Amino acid sequence: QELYSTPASRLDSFVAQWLQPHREWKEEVLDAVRTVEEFLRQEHFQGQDVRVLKVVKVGSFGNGTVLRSTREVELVAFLSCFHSFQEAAKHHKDVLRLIWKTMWQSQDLLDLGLEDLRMEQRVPDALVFTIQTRGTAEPITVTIVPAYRALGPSLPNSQPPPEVYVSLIKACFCPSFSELQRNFVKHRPTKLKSLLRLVKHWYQQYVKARSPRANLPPLYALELLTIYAWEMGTEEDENFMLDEGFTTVMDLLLEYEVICIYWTKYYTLHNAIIEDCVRKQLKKERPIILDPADPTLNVAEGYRWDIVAQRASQCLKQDCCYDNRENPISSWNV
């Protein structure tokens, strides 16, 4: 069975039965990742004496959208030796090499079958490796990106002080705000997570897999578009029709040339400098999907939305976007 041959009326069952990972498998993976997290927090890295002050899971394991097919766990490490955005940028690779050097001597990680260490140019660079789980000894890929801790402790989803974004804009994808990128997707209703899984699965299997060399947009852009569709289309209803949501996202993808989306979730227009930044962003070539966590980033800029629209057009012709009386599923209003 696959998505395109799944009737719209059966999408809830498809997501639940085909796309959800087994809960014990997820726990197996997180148990192994915990050892990496503990290593990072506890190790006195010998650069000065360097510490990872905080480690956060991001991407699918961080925001609750892990799929059956997910085989990577993404971590962001906040470093003691970065005191500005500029310092993090300058010493990003230095820190990854330091962490890598030290991992090869870690009895704990060696006992988890650590292998395949390399740096990958993931914009920004990531240290990438595999470890083996404790039960099955199955391999899982783990990635680490270093960050300047620009934000202090607070409730999930409070607003950063405007001065943080003023400094960002003065300083000239920003892992300093990765907790916010996480939270924006994580702190949503269960059924929205099902729609996110569905869209991500579709994107990976029918778009990314088919054009693996193309400059396709990041999954985050698709997450933001999906959230937008739901927020506007249902007035943030925890109860909604999954099939209508999926069709709505496909329709929106067709219209990429006129998409202009932003939020004042983590920044508002009250600060003149932030307002000026956002105003400037919104006048640029569309699609614009402004990062709710970072007013300087149009997450959609520069990517092959033309390819995505081509696949969305095909998707809309499939059983997953038709009812059982051969009527197209109707999309939400905005």
Numbering used by the authors: 5 to 51, 57 to 181, 187 to 348
From the paper:
We expressed the OLD (42 kDa) in E. coli and purified it to ∼95% homogeneity by immobilized metal affinity chromatography, affinity chromatography and size exclusion chromatography. Crystallization conditions for the OLD were established using standard commercial screens and the optimized crystals diffracted to 1.6 Å. Phases were determined by molecular replacement using the structure of porcine OAS1 as a search model. However, no density was observed for the four most N-terminal residues or for the two most C-terminal residues and the C-terminal 6xHis-tag. Likewise, two loop regions spanning the residues 52–56 and 182–186 did not display well-defined electron density. The N-terminal lobe harbors the five-stranded β-sheet found in all polymerases. The C-terminal lobe is a four-helix bundle with a three-stranded mixed β-sheet with an additional interstrand α-helix connection. The crystal structure of the OLD exhibits a high similarity with active OAS1 and both proteins form the αN4 helix, which is absent in inactive OAS1. Notably, only after the binding of dsRNA does OAS1 form a rigid αN4 helix, which participates in coordinating the triphosphate of the donor ATP in 2-5A synthesis, however, in OASL the αN4 is intrinsically present. OASL intrinsically forms the αN4 helix due to residues Val67, Phe70 and Asn72 that anchor the loop and form the αN4 helix.
